Structures are given as C-alpha cells and as structure tokens.
Amino acid sequence: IGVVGRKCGMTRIFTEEGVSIPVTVIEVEPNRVTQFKTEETDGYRAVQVTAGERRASRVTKAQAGHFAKANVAAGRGVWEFRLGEEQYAAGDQITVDLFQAGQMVDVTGESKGKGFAGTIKRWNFRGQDNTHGNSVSHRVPGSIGQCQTPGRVFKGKKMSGHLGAERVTVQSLEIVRVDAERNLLLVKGAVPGATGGDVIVRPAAKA
Amino acid sequence: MIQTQSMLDVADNSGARRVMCIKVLGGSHRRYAGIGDIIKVTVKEAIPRGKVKKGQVMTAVVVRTKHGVRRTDGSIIRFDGNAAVLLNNKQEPIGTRIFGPVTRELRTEKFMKIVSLAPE
Amino acid sequence: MRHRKSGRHLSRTSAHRKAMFQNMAVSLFEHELIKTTLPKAKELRRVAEPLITLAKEDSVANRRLAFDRTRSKAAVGKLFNDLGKRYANRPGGYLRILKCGFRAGDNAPMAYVELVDRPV
Amino acid sequence: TNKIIQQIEAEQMNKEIPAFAPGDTVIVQVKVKEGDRQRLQAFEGVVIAKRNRGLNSAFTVRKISNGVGVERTFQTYSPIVDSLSVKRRGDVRKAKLYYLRALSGKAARIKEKL
Amino acid sequence: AVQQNKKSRSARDMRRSHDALESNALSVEKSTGEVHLRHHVSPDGFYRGRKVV
RNA sequence: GAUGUCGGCUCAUCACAUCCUGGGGCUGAAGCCGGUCCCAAGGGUAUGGCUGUUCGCCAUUUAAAGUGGUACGCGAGCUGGGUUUAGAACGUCGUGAGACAGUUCGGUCCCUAUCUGCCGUGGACGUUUGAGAUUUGAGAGGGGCUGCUCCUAGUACGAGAGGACCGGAGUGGACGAACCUCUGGUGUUCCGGUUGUCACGCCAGUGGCAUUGCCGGGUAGCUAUGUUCGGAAAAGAUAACCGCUGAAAGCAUCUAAGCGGGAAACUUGCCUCAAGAUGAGAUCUCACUGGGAACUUGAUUCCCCUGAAGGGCCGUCGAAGACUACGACGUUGAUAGGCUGGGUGUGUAAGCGUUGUGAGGCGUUGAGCUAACCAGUACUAAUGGCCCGUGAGGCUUGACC
RNA sequence: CCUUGUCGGGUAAGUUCCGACCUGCACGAAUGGCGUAACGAUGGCGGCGCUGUCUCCACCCGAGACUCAGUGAAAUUGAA
RNA sequence: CAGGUGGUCGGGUAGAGAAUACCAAGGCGCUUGAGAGAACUCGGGUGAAGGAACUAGGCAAAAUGGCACCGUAACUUCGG
RNA sequence: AACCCACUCCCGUUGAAAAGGUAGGGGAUGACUUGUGGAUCGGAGUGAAAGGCUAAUCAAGCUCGGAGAUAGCUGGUUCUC
RNA sequence: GGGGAGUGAAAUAGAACCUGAAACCGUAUGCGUACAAGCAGUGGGAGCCUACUUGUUAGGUGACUGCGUACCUUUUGUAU
C-alpha cells in the first residue's frame, strides 16, 4: 500500500541543533479506494485509488460509471498498489496517517524531461579535444563498434535520444514530518519530476 | 590543494613558502582535496635555512581553501587563499607555529595539534 | 530546453526584436488594426498592452517613460489622450488577436491584431 | 501550491533579525558546540552580499583574521546565527559589494552614514 | 554515402505512404453561410456573427 | 578497374590462462604477512615526467593499476606527432645522375547514409462488436565496486618482538540516478553605472550604434563543482571444498542408492521496459434494440433507416516535445496573454523645493519595471461542425438452463 | 650506429634541453673551419603572466539542423 | 559567382591619421521566406575551484596594448 | 593604413571560390608595388634556382599533320540445330 | 490551357502536328499481401474473380509447400 500525491515544492527544515534538512514536500489530498482486486476475481491482490478533482465534462460515461460503483465522485487519474494481505472497502479513504516520522519511504515520479540529449549529457561520454586540430567532432560520439567483426553495432549500444520523462523511483528517503492537518509529507531530499507532478509514495522496499 | 599542479601557500612555521600538489591522496581516481584532506606536495620555494628544502616530495594537510568548506546549516566558510601545513611520515606537523586561521573541521584526532597552535 | 522560459526569438537578434516590437506597437496605436504574423502578434501584446496600462495615469514621468520605450512623439500623444481615456476601466486585454488565414508568398500564418473599442 | 510551502517556511521564521544593509559592519554571534559545550563566538566583519529569499535568505560577511581574508555566507534564519548586531552603517550605493576582494587595506574601507 | 543498388519502385512508394495530405477544419458562419477555416476570420471578414474587417 | 599505416583520442565488446574483491586445499602456514594449487568473469582495474611512440625507464598513488581476441577492434568517429611524394641540409657511398643498418627542418586527411545494424520517436493495422480506464508478467534491460578508522582485543597467537580472524556501526573514494531547498555558475528577455558618437527642436531626460560597446550585479529556467539517494541484507540452487550414513570389497571409503553444509558466479530479490507474449491475456464500467431483391444460402452485396459510447481535426497551452506523441484546458472555463496585489532583482528614477561660481550634494524613497516567479477570474483569445466510429456482436461442440 | 654513452644542471620524475668528457661507426679548415652583436612568420628547451588547452564541461547569443510554403540537385545503381 | 580590376575626389565629432567608432552629402535592406528554439555543427559571450594536469607541440584561446615622465641587464661590430 | 604579400588557426572540400573567407600575421622609400605599349617560345625561351614558369596544362606548351604510330598487353566479338 | 461547335476522308492529322515503340510515370478494375526471412523463379497447389459451356476447359491472381547463392568476363577454381 502507498499513497498518491504531488511534488509541491522543495523547502528546508532547520532543527534546534542547527542542521538544515533538504526537504521536498508532497501534498496528498486524501486518496479514495475505487476497486479492491482479490485473487478470486483478478488473480492478484491490489487496490485501485483516486486523488480528487476532475471536471464532469472531462470524465467519460464509462469512467464516470466506474466511479459510481464505488460511491466516489473521483478526480484525476487512477493508481493501483500491490497489497500483501490488507483489506480496503471500496469507499474507504487512505491518508498520510499511513506514514509516521523516521520511516524510510520510496518515492516514484516521472523524471523531468530533457528533450533529445547527446551522448555527453545522456550517457556521461567524455568530449574530445576542442582545439588540438580536432575537426567537427567536438561532442559527437567516437566509434560505435569494432570492425568487420562483429561487422555491426551491438544491441543496447549507448547513443543519444530521448533522455527524459521516464518513471523514476528514489528509495530510502526519510520522512521528516507527517502533517495530517494540511495533508502533507515532508520527505528528506529530492524526488523525481517537476512541481505539481503526480507522485507515488510507499514503504521502503529495502529496510 | 584541490588538484594536482595546484600551488598553495604554507600555513605552518618552518621551511617552504610555496608548495605544489603532485598527488591527491585518498582514493584511486580521486581528483579533489578540500580542507582536512591529505595531499602530496613538492617544495617549490623555501626560506634560506628551514626544516625543508626546495625540491622535496612531502606530505601536507589542506587547511584553508578558496572553494571553502560547508557547515551543516548550509552555511559556507570560504577563504582568500590556498594554504597547507606540511607533515612528516607520522602525519604530525613539522613546524611549531601555525599562521592564519583554520576551520573546526580540522580539530579531529590527528590534526588538533594544528588547531591548538592556530590563531583562529 | 526552455523550461518555463518566455519570449520568441523569431530568428533575429535581441536588438532587432526590440526595434520591431516597437515599430509594430507604434503602428498599432496609429492605425488600431494591423495585419501581422500570428507568432509575431502573440509577442506584440506583451509590449503594446503595458504601454496602454502606463498611459492610464497621465503624468510627466509616464509620458517620458512611454517615450523611452516607443521613441515616437506621435504615438505617445496618441496614448495618454485616447488610449488611456478609452481603456481606463478595462482591466487588460486592450487588443484582440484574430487569425486570418495564411500569407500567399510563403505560408506564414497571419492574424489581425486590433484594439477592442475601435470607433470604426 | 506555493501557499502551503510558504506557510511551512513562515513557521520557522519567528526569529528577529534586525535591519542591516550591505556595506555595514556587523557582528554575528554564532553558536559552536563541538567537544560538547554551548558557547557563543563572535564574527565581526563587513556585509558584502545579502540574499533576500525569505527563509532561504542569506548574507555574506567579510572579515580579515591574521592577514587572511575570509568569507562566511550565513543563513539568516539558521539557529547557528544566534543574534546579529550592526556596528557601523555603510554608504555604498550598490547591492553586491564583491569589489572589496581586490582591495587590500585602506582601499577596502567603507564610509559611514550620518 | 550512396546506394549500392537502386531502390525498387515498390520501396520508393512504400516510403511515401506517409506523405498523404490532411484536410483543414472547415466550418460555416451561421450568419452569412460561407465556409471558412475553423477559428479563423472568414474570407469576407466575418467572425462569430460579426464583421471584424 | 585501391581492402588507405604506427600511436594517441572517443567508444567499446568478448574470453579466462584472475590484477583486486569473494569461497577453499596443502605448506618448510605460530601470528602479521606470504608461497603454491584449485573454484570463481559479478563489479572494479591510476595520474604524471621523458619520448612520435606501443613498450620501457622513472616520480607519486591505489584494494588493484591483469593477460589475450575483436582487419596487432575502431580515420564514410577524430587527430596526423612517427613512417611519409615533391624542398632543403649533415654524415657516409658513387666519377656522376643519385642513393641510404642513417639522421635533420618543412609539408592538402574528401563523402549530405540508400540497405543491414544501433539509439530514439511515431503512422498504419491486428488483437473477432466498439469504447474510457486500470493492470497480470512470459520475456528483456539496468544495477552489482571499495578504502579507512574505530568498537571485540593488544584478546586468540607468540619467550618476547608483533598481531588477529570471526562479529556491528560511520566516514570516505570512484561510479550511477534523481534534483535545484542550500553553496555557486549562467542568465544578449531585468536593474544600474559608464566611454565615444549621432539623434529625439534645444536644456534636461532618454534612445540607436559601437562584440550585449565595455562593465557591475542578477529573477525564473537549465546546471555541477551543490544536495539527496543507491550498490544491499535475504532466499533458492550450486562451484571447488568439507562432510553424514554406506555397500560393492566382513573392514575402509562424500556415493553406488540416500542426506547435507558451501562463493560477489547462476535463479529470484532491487529498478525500468513489457500481451505485436499473433500464445495478442485479465478486471471494472460504458454505448448501440428498421426492411425488400437476385443468386449460390460464413450468405453476401445493394438500396431506405440512422449515427451512440467515444476518438480525432481545430484552438488556448505545458516543468511534454526535432515533427510527433504524451499531458492539461476550450465559456457548465480558469489554458495562455494582460490586469490587480504579494515577492524578487537592481539600488535612492524623473520632476521640483533645497544647495554651491561650477562639477557635484538629502528627502519623495529604499521608486518605477517586472522577465520567466507566486496569488482571482467572464479584460482578450480558446465558436454546442458533423469528419471518423454505428444500429446488439459468426459458426461448431460441451456444461448448466 | 651502438645509445636514452657517461658525468654535471634544470623537474617530484627529463629519450628532448644546457654545460662538459672524448671511446669522432661516419667533423675539419673557401662542397670553407671555429666564433659572433644585430636580425628572423627559423629549429629545440626553460620561466613569468594569462587563460575552457585540460580536470569537466555548464549556461547563454546568433547561423544551420527540425517543421510548414515555393523551387529543386549530386556521387551511386545487375536485380532485389 | 564572399574573387579580381589602373587612376581621381574626399565633409563632421572623437583621433597621430585616408586607422577606427559614430554620422552628413549620397547610397542601401545584399531576389526564398515563415515558424520551432532537440542532439549535433558553425561563429561568438560569461564562468565556481584549480591553472598547461592538455597536447606531438601553450595549437588555439586568454593576456599585453595609448601618451607623457621615471627607470632599464648581459653582451656589443659603439649604431645597438 | 592603402597597397603588395601569404606564416598560422579554423571554416569550406558536391565549396560562395578548379586555391577563397574570417580572426591574427610579413614588407610597407624600395633589390618596392603597379598601369600601358613592347622584346624573348618548345631540346626553345625565362628562372634572387623550385624542374619553377611559358594562357586553370610543363622532367619539354598548344594545335594540326606522319596516323587507324606501336601495343607478345587489356577489354569486347551479335541467329539456331 | 481546355469543353463544345465547325473544317476535313481522318483532329487520339490542331501546328511541339504521319507512324508514334521501349524504358519511365499514372488512373481504373480483378486477385494476392500487415507472425513472416534470402537470386524472387520453378514443381506441386487451395481459394477467389472473369469470360464462356458443361468441365476431366480458357484467361487472371497465387495462400501454402519441395528444390533453388543472378549474368558476363577471367581463371586451377568465383554466389563471390
């Protein structure tokens, strides 16, 4: 089980002992369970959830009919969490109160999208010399293979292309503050993506 | 100082006036050394009679950088000039006086002799 | 990468753009209906709309400020007398942009950009 | 929403910070704690740069100890900065005052106001 | 870098299976009854039931 | 009827005959270190001074600076120092033109990628009625490094000297991912100063041009040198190795049946992609309920009948982007611009009171912008077309009707 | 040639360099010998200053690339 | 067709100047444009901390740059 | 500076250009640069000398003849049984 | 530049003018083709579609499948 929120900024906490903690905050408007999938009906155990606010003209009849089974009046997106053995009713409401302090938490967002990057900014390649007579190959890559053998480029070769908007998961980030009144997690460090991007928070996979 | 070929003043008492880093010690491809780190120097310039001579491969602790050192609140402390304190093979200072300030990142178990002599 | 960056380059230098968007703005306060390019009209209203807002407060420090960023005497007196007494209770949106087909020579997308309360 | 992260910052911002400008000579009372004690250490010098970003606000003060120039960029609302006190106000007509770095002893003197 | 073999006309025409043109979004003024591009001024100068030029 | 050198650079990929890290046997292995031989290819595996160098010799590192194959990998990726065409010189050889187990200075490196390959990103179609959304995971990729202090313990060990394995922290390095709160960088879209000059009628004030004329700063964004996080533990099956029971072979033997322990290798674990996985899967919801004719009865085509769910075009845009696609929104609207505050940056504008012979001196004042930043909305621009998609979804068999 | 001879200096380290030695494979006195101020877009070395040369690249500004409109090539090609 | 082509004239402010910057008289917008603001390429701008660690080699870039006055080494063929 | 040159970098190499451009660079009262007219030519001129130059050609120009040179070499040689 | 009308024996003899071939480029129609690897054919062969007459035909297409590395020249030998 986890929670769906939004990257609401990047802040700092000063402690009394004098250390500023790098903080991003994740505002989590109370999620609402939509469908509870069991093995008897779906093969695996999971719970659909929905983070609120979607205008009626943007909700389709099929989508609107699904929020209607669960009396939810649901908003933007639907997300699913693989459960081990938890039981959620299909009208319940999961909040930040599912996390405490300390707590190591993994955060998965959509990384910030760099357009089409080169081999230097995408794969950390070393640029060639800028003057010792170098021709027009300043940041172009070097050779892409050996010679007649293998006589082709191998699959996976590191080249340039969409460096960017990819699902990225940051793990083991400590939870410095759980605010159930303003519906906030304050997480120590950086989380992937831009401000307001939808972001998934759940218990650390490595403990 | 920070890297090799870098040239840096001498904050302790006797011998050199300028030393040049010829190796940053520590790791393997290690490329930088800040305050509290151990470099390998050579003596580029020295006084007429002192405990070191010009042209001598020695070891020195970095005490005072222009890149600076950062505190836990986020604050930085940043100096105008690069400076080291030369050491022996005990990694104990050779001179008996320290000139200029140092930082509190240097009052560890090995370098508190430099701190206790410094007019910080 | 231009994340959250404002302003079109329009394939000319920064001093050319500043010359063009005050030639365009001065032409628009004179004629009140000019036919220009569609990206070039979207960038006009970030120049010509703050000149009318400025000319709603008739003042000697506003008339020689509008003259600093129009450098035309005729279109400062067309402001501060007409456009600023028309638009005194209109909170922005002094000009509308109406797309009108494509240019014939190249295939440039045209627009009409037009002040809202024209007498006609 | 920026309204809820500027409200997290406003909760931490209940410390005084008297008014001081670049050019002024100030005494920062810093806390030191290592080798466990809680004593207070002065850092007197010239404010050369202010950052004015709310909780993220900062200032850079320039001192010279023992013939060595030395900068601390402070964090204005950190609890390391215990208190602040302006010694003499300066007359500089410039915001970031980094030209003092090339001046040594008497060219690096600020005028006073009033 | 050149061909070692000329392209077949089967493959020459497979390439240009993506080069077919698209149509414009046209619509009719309710007042005048003339076709114009959607979201554009009419070729007589009408836009949403009003002469603008 | 051309397959263009050596080396460096950039990028690699495989091998194991292993340089480091991991597991072991034997030792002429007390310990600390080693020697030697097995097992092991997961990840790591210098920087410079000389030289055209490969190497090599040296300086200082490191846990370690492995050995090979790949046209002595790689010039339609780079260089062009060596060799090296035309010039020139030195030594030598020849009467000479000229030559070289030789030296020395100088000396043009072309190609817009069709096909295969590769990195990206789409269009079509198919998934058996169509659709909005959420997923299972067959398979595939990434990742996998390590030093130091301390704590056990100067304890085991050793006459002493010297010094542990085995166990848990917390601090680095190199590497990778994210990020921009901080420290900074940039910021030709912001604010100042200032030189020369031309102009705005002139004075003031400003504006063009001079690399942004030159410069001081500097918002947002992007960024590293900044910040945060990572590599696991764990499980299973093993490798050498160590066995337990135990015959063949009254005994002995890890083995022939049977049962185990056992490594960074292998399989999961962690991360990402993933039903074009044509074996095209699964859930939840949604939407569509008229007839004649020939001819051969998946029966189809034809007309009349209507076009839903939804999708798309278009428009306003985006922290999404080469085009796309993806995402948000289109008046039942807050998507962009403006406007209204708030912030930020710059640093006390203009005008006039004031002041001196003049250059120049306080307040208003710590102002107007406002760039990208943060805050409501009917100021402006996002227009209730019919373009697509239809009219209940074949047959056979079986179970329950 | 052996050869990076040997020794001294310069560097942390110097096959180059400087000064020597003479064991001149294979210097030598108008195919001139050995010096030499001034000179040089001359060859080799070393230092200061200066720096994106580099560690290691980051951002920015213009011209192409990409897109749309118009015009419209080339080398190559047995067939695919 | 960024090339070449003898000679003549030559205003203003700054300036030694016919250099150069900005302008007058005079001439001109260089006969494809519009967007967009990826990699990469080109010509530039700024750069933390280092400062030749680059490389065959400081190649390139950065730096120096005027006038007056002071001061100025070895060596010299007495001019430098 | 003009002017004449052409040392270096990069771009350009299907170029804007069958040798340029941009940024720097050498000479710049002289053995200088240049206009116009003239003189010398193919085993022949001219050359501060490189086999350089003699109309984008030079270890012997271009053109037309000997001439369909010669080629022990290359390539090709066409309907059927 | 065409669509007619006229002219002529004929205008698909209309001046780029008799005939008007081939490469090359089109439109219409029938069949094939989006899970299948390579000289592109050949042997086998279903279905579908046209004409006809009986069917044991004729034309088109060719799912699926067996075998299958062009041609010249030169050579001891070339898919090369």
CATH at B87: 2.40.150.20
3-state secondary structure of C41: helix
The token pair at D114 is 């009033």
Resolution to 1 decimal place, in Å: 2.9
Where does D1-114 show beta strands of DSSP type E? Answer: 25-32, 39-51, 58-65, 68-75, 81-88
Angle, CA E43 vertex, CA E39 and CA E44 arms, to 5° = 115
| Closest-lying nucleotide for E3 based on CA to C1' | F114
CA distance B3 to A1: 49
CA distance D109 to A52: 60
Nearest residue of B to residue A13, measured between CA atoms: B73
Determine whether the distance from the CB of E2 to the nearest atom of strand F is below 7 Å.
yes
Strand order in the sheet with A79-82: A79-82, A46-50, A31-37, A93-94
Burial class (CB in 10 A: 0-12, 13-18, 19+), A81: buried
The token pair at A15 is 């402690």
Task: For domain C13-115, give its CATH number from 2.120.10.10, 3.20.20.450, 1.10.510.10, 3.90.1030.10.
Answer: 3.90.1030.10
Domain boundaries along the sequence of chain C: 13-115
Terminal Cα distance for chain A, rounded: 16
CA distance E40 to C81: 33
Dihedral angle at the C-alpha atoms of E26, E28, E29, E31, nearest 10 degrees?
Answer: 170
Please report which helix (H) or strand (E) contains residue C115, including its range.
strand C109-115
Strand-strand pairing, B83-87 and B7-10:
parallel
Burial class (CB in 10 A: 0-12, 13-18, 19+), C55: buried
**Cβ contacts of D78 on chain A, cutoff 8 Å:** 14, 18, 20
Asked if residue A138 belongs to a known ligand binding site, the reply is yes
This structure was determined by cryo-EM
Task: Tell me how many domains chain B contains.
Answer: 1
Within 13 A of A187's CA, how many CA atoms are on the CB side?
32
Residue from C33, C35, C100 whose CB has the most chain E CBs within 10 Å, to mutate: C100
CA→C1' distance for A45 and F263 (Å): 37
Strand-strand pairing, C109-115 and A167-179:
unpaired
* DSSP code per residue over C44-106: TTTTSHHHHHHTTS--HHHHHHHTTTT--SHHHHSBTTTBTTSSTT--S--EEEEEEEE-SSS
The token pair at A114 is 């760099």
- Give residue for tokens 């609302």: D77
Rg (CA), chain C: 15
Looking at chain A from residue 17 to 46, which residues have their Cβ under 8 Å from any Cβ of chain B? 18-20
Strand-strand pairing, A79-82 and C109-115:
unpaired
**Cβ contacts of C33 on chain E, cutoff 8 Å:** 53
Burial class (CB in 10 A: 0-12, 13-18, 19+), A76: middle
Q: Do chains E and B touch by CB distance (3+ pairs < 8 Å)?
A: no
CA distance C23 to A176: 56
Of A183, A163, A165, A185, nearest to A175 by C-alpha is A185
E42 CB neighbour count, 10 Å cutoff: 22
Min Cα separation A164/chain C (Å): 11
CA distance E40 to D47: 59
Range(s) of the domain holding residue B34:
1-120
Of B70, B86, B76, nearest to B9 by C-alpha is B86
* DSSP code per residue over E6-33: PPPHHHHHHHTTS-PPPPP-EEE-TTT-
**Cβ contacts of B73 on chain A, cutoff 8 Å:** 14, 18-20
Q: 3-state secondary structure string, chain B?
A: CCCCCCEEEECECCCEEEEEEEEECCCCCCCCCCCCCEEEEEEEEECCCCCCCCCCEEEEEEEECCCCEECCCCCEEEECCCEEEEECCCCCECCCCECCCCCHHHCCCCCHHHHHHCCC
Find out whether A5 and A26 touch, Cβ atoms under 8 Å.
yes
Cis ω for the linkage preceding B48 (within 30 of 0): no
CA distance A72 to A65: 10
Find out whether C34 and C24 touch, Cβ atoms under 8 Å.
yes
- Would you call B34 an interface residue with chain D, using a CB distance cutoff of 8 Å? no
CA distance A183 to D21: 39
Backbone angles phi, psi at C115, to 5 degrees: -70, 150
CA distance A36 to A148: 57
Nearest residue of D to residue B67, measured between CA atoms: D71
Cα→Cα distances D38→A146, D31, D79, D82, Å = 65, 7, 12, 12
Find out whether C48 and C20 touch, Cβ atoms under 8 Å.
no
Find out whether A37 and A13 touch, Cβ atoms under 8 Å.
no
CA distance C21 to C39: 12
- Give residue for tokens 């930088």: B32
**Cβ contacts of B72 on chain A, cutoff 8 Å:** 18-20
CA distance C22 to C69: 7
Find out whether C113 and C99 touch, Cβ atoms under 8 Å.
no
Q: In this complex, do B78 and D73 lie within 8 Å of one another by their Cβ atoms?
A: yes
Q: In this complex, do D71 and B107 lie within 8 Å of one another by their Cβ atoms?
A: no
Cα→Cα distances A101→A105, A179, C6, D96, Å = 10, 10, 41, 41
The token pair at C53 is 């807002």
